């Protein structure tokens, strides 16, 4: 019927004075734009069809053509920034917002989706969608006693669109928009659908990716316990954003970090630091590095949960980027830790794998390790065991590596290595 029309036939039908011919041509356009292989987005734009689709969004007495044009425009807006911009430039944003209140759920859903693609283009279009007033009607769609009475796909699209209104930086979303969205977002974060949970966690991760004031906005809503629960989920698409959110939160103040610890997060890190997905291990070790950059009582809670052996393990064997995060976690630990915590770190076996990482061709990790080693030596000086440490570093071949660092192509590396071999191995 409407399968595989040419752009020319679509144009002919949409330019007729016949609402039904326009409906069939718009459906044919929708089908072209929904084909799996390279939809003719640019051809549809160059035909000048976006304005007509936008006008069709307003034809209340023909809900089928509203739906079909909403879908066509959704898929145009799914493309490049230029194609989304073509949709916006046609006046689509206000028409979709007006469709959010459509009594036909499939049409409102299509408007939600379209607005999500527009907002997903980036910060400018996100904020323009917000200025046109999309948040009120979007959240009104979710103002029900129990989210379970909404259709799974409807709810998933609403959540994904909201996540895009929370996404992107430079600039971040308007503070008032975030505050308006958060109560609904937290309600979705407690819903039982894995895709709703994943996109809610992503939204929260976006909101916590920034200065401490944004973190505080989120933490004040009490979502941290729920984030830790999701951190222990089986579905990787949930763990990943939950871990990202937790990592963001612990980049904030020590109080925010403590909220994460008190929620029980550290108990999940035995699994996360041994998680077979490289990205989980990396992000978990990054989160650990930011926790070991906290207070001494927080380092102490890292110790109490038994995570130092897991950092020793990561340092001993993991993808290099994870090992770099583990090196950072060790340097932070040794910069902020007590002498007893630093010796405990050594008794867990940190020295050998740290020295083994000194044979890397990356200069940052080298400097990080030398700083950690120096901090450990300073601890030994406070204990008088500097010589025992020097010996330990020598047995595992570390002295050779430091001597080689003397002839390194970096100045700070040279100064650190020379300083170590002069203050200790002399």
């Amino acid at each position: 019927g409407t399968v595989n029309w040419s752009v020319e036939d679509i144009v002919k039908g949409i330019n007729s004075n016949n609402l039904e011919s326009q409906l069939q041509a718009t459906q044919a356009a929708r089908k072209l734009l929904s084909r799996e292989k390279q939809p003719p987005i640019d051809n549809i734009i160059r035909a000048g069809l976006i304005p007509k689709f936008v006008s069709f969004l307003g034809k209340t007495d023909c809900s089928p053509i509203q739906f079909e044009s909403a879908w066509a425009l959704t898929n145009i807006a799914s493309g490049t920034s230029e194609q989304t911009k073509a949709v916006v430039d046609g006046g689509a944003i206000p028409a979709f917002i007006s469709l959010l209140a459509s009594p036909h759920a499939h049409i409102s859903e299509q408007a939600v989706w379209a607005l999500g693609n527009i907002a997903g283009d980036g910060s400018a279009f996100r904020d323009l969608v917000i200025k046109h007033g999309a948040i009120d009607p979007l959240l009104a769609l979710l103002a029900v006693p129990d989210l379970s009475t909404l259709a799974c796909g409807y709810l998933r699209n609403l959540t994904w669109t909201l996540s895009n209104l929370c996404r992107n930086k430079n600039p971040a979303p308007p503070l008032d928009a975030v505050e308006q969205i958060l109560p609904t977002l937290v309600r979705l974060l407690h819903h039982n659908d894995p895709e709703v949970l994943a996109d809610s966690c992503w939204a929260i991760s976006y909101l916590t990716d920034g200065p401490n004031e944004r973190i505080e906005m989120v933490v004040k809503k009490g979502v941290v316990p729920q984030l830790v629960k999701l951190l222990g989920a089986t579905e990787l698409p949930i763990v990943t954003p939950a871990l990202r959110a937790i990592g963001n939160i612990v980049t904030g103040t020590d109080e925010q970090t403590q909220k994460v610890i008190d929620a029980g997060a550290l108990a999940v890190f035995p699994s996360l630091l041994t998680n077979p997905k490289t990205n989980i291990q990396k992000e978990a070790t990054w989160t650990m590095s930011n926790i070991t950059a906290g207070r001494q009582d927080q380092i102490q809670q890292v110790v109490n949960h038994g995570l130092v052996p897991f950092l020793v393990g990561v340092l001993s064997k993991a993808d290099f980027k994870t090992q770099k995060e583990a090196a950072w976690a060790i340097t932070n630990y040794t910069s902020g830790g007590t002498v007893e915590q630093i010796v405990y770190l050594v008794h867990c076996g940190i020295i050998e794998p740290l020295m083994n990482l000194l044979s890397a061709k990356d200069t940052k990790i080298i400097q990080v390790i030398l700083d950690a080693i120096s901090n450990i030596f300073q601890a030994a000086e406070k204990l008088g065991e500097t010589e025992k440490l020097s010996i330990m570093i020598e047995e595992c071949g570390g002295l050779d590596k430091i001597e080689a660092l003397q002839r390194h192509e970096n100045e700070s590396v040279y100064k650190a290595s020379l300083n170590l071999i002069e203050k200790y191995f002399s």
Binding site: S34, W71, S78, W113, G120, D121, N164
Partner: peptide, 8 residues
């Protein structure tokens, strides 16, 4: 798919 979603 995360930024933009084409409806197929």
């Amino acid at each position: 798919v995360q930024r933009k979603r084409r409806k197929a």
